[PDB]
Write an enzyme that holds these catalytic residues in place. Structure first.
Site, mmCIF file in Angstrom:
data_model
loop_
_atom_site.group_PDB
_atom_site.id
_atom_site.type_symbol
_atom_site.label_atom_id
_atom_site.label_comp_id
_atom_site.label_asym_id
_atom_site.label_seq_id
_atom_site.Cartn_x
_atom_site.Cartn_y
_atom_site.Cartn_z
ATOM 1 N N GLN A 174 40.951 42.624 41.802
ATOM 2 C CA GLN A 174 40.868 41.974 40.522
ATOM 3 C C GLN A 174 40.941 42.888 39.375
ATOM 4 O O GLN A 174 40.645 44.051 39.497
ATOM 5 C CB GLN A 174 39.546 41.220 40.420
ATOM 6 C CG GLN A 174 39.459 40.227 41.539
ATOM 7 C CD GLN A 174 38.137 39.488 41.545
ATOM 8 O OE1 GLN A 174 37.315 39.543 40.580
ATOM 9 N NE2 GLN A 174 37.909 38.803 42.642
ATOM 10 N N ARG B 118 44.130 38.362 39.391
ATOM 11 C CA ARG B 118 44.218 38.919 40.724
ATOM 12 C C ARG B 118 45.404 39.860 40.896
ATOM 13 O O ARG B 118 46.423 39.709 40.239
ATOM 14 C CB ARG B 118 44.269 37.822 41.744
ATOM 15 C CG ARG B 118 42.930 37.073 41.832
ATOM 16 C CD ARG B 118 43.122 35.793 42.591
ATOM 17 N NE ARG B 118 42.050 34.846 42.359
ATOM 18 C CZ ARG B 118 42.124 33.805 41.525
ATOM 19 N NH1 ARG B 118 43.232 33.507 40.864
ATOM 20 N NH2 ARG B 118 41.086 33.008 41.411
ATOM 21 N N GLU C 198 31.088 44.118 34.541
ATOM 22 C CA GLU C 198 30.278 44.077 35.780
ATOM 23 C C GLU C 198 29.792 45.429 36.272
ATOM 24 O O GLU C 198 30.381 46.453 36.053
ATOM 25 C CB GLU C 198 30.922 43.292 36.970
ATOM 26 C CG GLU C 198 32.376 43.034 36.792
ATOM 27 C CD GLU C 198 32.940 41.990 37.732
ATOM 28 O OE1 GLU C 198 32.134 41.246 38.360
ATOM 29 O OE2 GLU C 198 34.183 41.937 37.788
ATOM 30 N N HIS D 77 40.065 46.620 40.903
ATOM 31 C CA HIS D 77 38.955 46.898 41.818
ATOM 32 C C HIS D 77 38.816 45.813 42.854
ATOM 33 O O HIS D 77 39.288 44.722 42.647
ATOM 34 C CB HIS D 77 37.626 46.967 41.028
ATOM 35 C CG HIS D 77 37.410 45.800 40.112
ATOM 36 N ND1 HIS D 77 37.470 45.902 38.735
ATOM 37 C CD2 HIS D 77 37.084 44.505 40.371
ATOM 38 C CE1 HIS D 77 37.254 44.707 38.190
ATOM 39 N NE2 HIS D 77 36.958 43.860 39.161
#
Length: 391
Positions: free
Chosen positions: A99, A274, A134, A255
Site C-alpha cells: 500500500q 494498492r 501509521e 509498504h
C-alpha cells in the site's frame, strides 16, 4: 467511572489468524474463525463500547459525540472534532497487500477530483480527504516491507533477474529515480506473455539465490503466485521487527505487512492506493503520481524511541497521534496527557487507579481515559502501551 474498560470489536477478515489472539491473550474463538484485527477506538463501522453507571453499554463514539471537550480535550476537539486515531492489534496469518498513502494535500485534491463524478466502487481511490499516517509496533516477530532500497542495493538484487523484463535492464543501465519509477509502473502493468515471462524468470532465480529477500519472495509466492508484487522485495526494504520495535509509515511510500502480530496506530481515513499483492484493480498512474521514488537506507527505517523514567516515547512526526510504552512496577507511575488516551496491556498485568477506582487489565485488555480524567496511576508488572495526542 473515571476509567472505562473497553469492549472491543474483532474483525474476522479472511486473512486473519485463527489462533494468534487466543495464544497471546486468551481471547476465545471456539468457532475457529480468522481473527484479523482487534479494534480499539471510535470507528463508526465498529466502535468500541464502554459500560455505564447503570449497567448499559454505550458506543464510545456516541459517548464522545455527547461530550467532546470533556472526553477529547479542547485541543483535539477543536482540531479534529473526533477521536483522531484508531488503534489495532493486527494478526496477519498471510501476507497482505502493498500500500501507499497519499499525503494530506493530495488526499484533499483526489477526494474532490473524484466527488465530481460513485462511492463504494473500485476506481474510488479517495474515500475521504484525510491523510493516513501509521505506526506499527511489533508484538511478535514482524516481517514487513517499507520504502525503496538504496539504488545500488536494488541494482545488486535485480542482476539475477535482468532478463525478466526490459524495464529491469533499463533501470540497470542507468539506476536513477526516473527509471525506478518506470520499473515500478511497468512491473505492475505487466500482462499475458510479458508477465508470465517475468514471473518464470523470478521463480527460477529462487532456485539459484539463497537468503533474503529471496526467501521473503518464496513466502509471498505461496499466497500470490501470479502477482507482479513478487518483484517488490527486490525494490523495497524487507524488515523483520523484533518485538518492541516500531516503524512509522511515511506518506508516498510503499509498504506491506507480511507476517506476524503487531499493534498499529493510524489516523482516520479509509484511503489506500494498492501497489501489488492484491487481486484488485490498481490505478497505476495515480499510484505513481503519489509515490516518492527516493531510496530509504535500512538504518533509518525503525523509529528510535526515547526513554524517560518509566516511559518509552515513540516520536511521530505528525499530530494525529502519539504512542508510548510504560514499564510497570510495584510503585505507581502517573500517566497523564492533555488528550483522550487508550491504554492497552501488552504483557504482565496492570492496575490502574484513579482516586478510589481501581481497574485491572490483563494482557490484551484496554481502557479509555477521557481528557477530563487524566492523570491515572499505574502499577503492576509488564508494560502498558498508550495512544494519545501530544498537542
Amino acid at each position: 467511572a473515571s476509567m472505562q474498560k473497553l469492549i472491543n470489536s474483532v474483525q474476522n477478515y479472511a486473512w486473519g489468524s485463527k489462533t494468534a489472539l487466543t495464544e497471546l491473550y486468551g481471547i476465545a474463538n471456539p468457532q475457529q474463525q480468522p481473527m484479523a484485527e482487534l479494534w480499539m477506538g471510535a470507528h463508526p463501522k465498529s466502535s468500541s463500547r464502554i459500560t455505564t453507571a447503570n449497567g448499559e453499554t454505550v458506543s464510545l463514539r456516541d459517548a464522545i459525540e455527547k461530550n467532546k471537550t470533556a472526553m477529547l480535550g479542547e485541543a483535539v476537539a477543536n482540531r479534529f472534532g473526533e477521536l483522531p486515531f484508531l488503534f489495532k492489534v493486527l494478526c496477519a496469518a498471510q501476507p497482505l497487500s502493498i500500500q501507499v498513502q497519499p499525503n494530506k494535500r493530495n488526499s484533499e485534491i483526489g477526494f474532490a477530483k473524484e466527488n465530481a463524478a460513485p462511492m463504494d466502487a473500485a476506481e474510488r481511490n479517495y474515500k475521504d480527504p484525510n491523510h493516513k499516517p501509521e505506526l506499527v509496533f511489533a508484538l511478535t516477530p514482524f516481517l514487513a516491507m517499507n520504502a525503496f532500497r538504496e539504488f545500488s542495493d536494488i541494482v545488486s538484487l535485480l542482476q539475477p533477474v535482468a532478463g525478466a523484463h526490459s524495464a529491469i535492464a533499463h533501470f540497470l543501465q542507468v539506476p536513477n529515480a526516473e527509471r525506478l519509477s518506470q520499473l515500478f509502473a511497468s512491473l505492475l502493468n505487466m500482462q499475458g506473455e510479458e508477465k508470465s515471462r517475468a514471473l518464470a524468470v523470478l521463480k527460477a532465480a529462487l532456485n539459484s539465490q539463497q537468503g533474503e529477500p529471496w526467501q521473503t519472495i518464496r513466502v509471498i509466492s505461496e499466497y500470490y503466485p501470479d502477482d507482479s508484487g513478487l518483484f517488490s522485495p527486490l525494490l523495497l526494504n524487507v524488515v523483520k521487527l523484533n518485538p518492541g520495535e516500531a516503524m512509522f509509515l511515511f506518506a508516498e511510500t510503499p509498504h506491506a505487512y507480511l507476517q506476524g502480530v503487531a499493534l498499529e496506530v493510524m489516523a482516520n481515513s479509509d484511503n489506500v492506493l494498492r501497489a501489488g499483492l492484491t487481486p484488485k484493480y490498481i490505478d497505476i498512474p495515480e499510484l505513481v503520481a503519489n509515490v516518492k521514488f527516493e531510496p530509504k537506507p535500512a538504518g533509518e527505517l525503525l523509529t528510535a524511541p526515547v526513554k524517560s523514567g518509566a516511559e518509552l516515547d515513540f516520536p511521530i512526526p505528525v499530530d494525529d497521534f502519539a504512542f508510548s510504552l510504560h514499564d510497570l512496577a510495584l510503585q505507581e507511575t502517573s500517566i497523564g496527557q492533555h488528550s483522550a488516551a487508550i491504554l492497552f496491556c501488552v504483557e504482565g498485568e496492570a492496575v490502574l487507579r484513579k482516586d478510589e477506582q481501581r481497574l485491572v487489565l490483563k494482557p490484551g485488555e484496554s481502557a479509555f481515559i477521557g481528557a477530563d480524567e487524566s492523570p491515572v496511576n499505574a502499577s503492576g508488572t509488564g508494560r502498558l502501551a498508550r495512544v494519545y495526542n501530544k498537542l
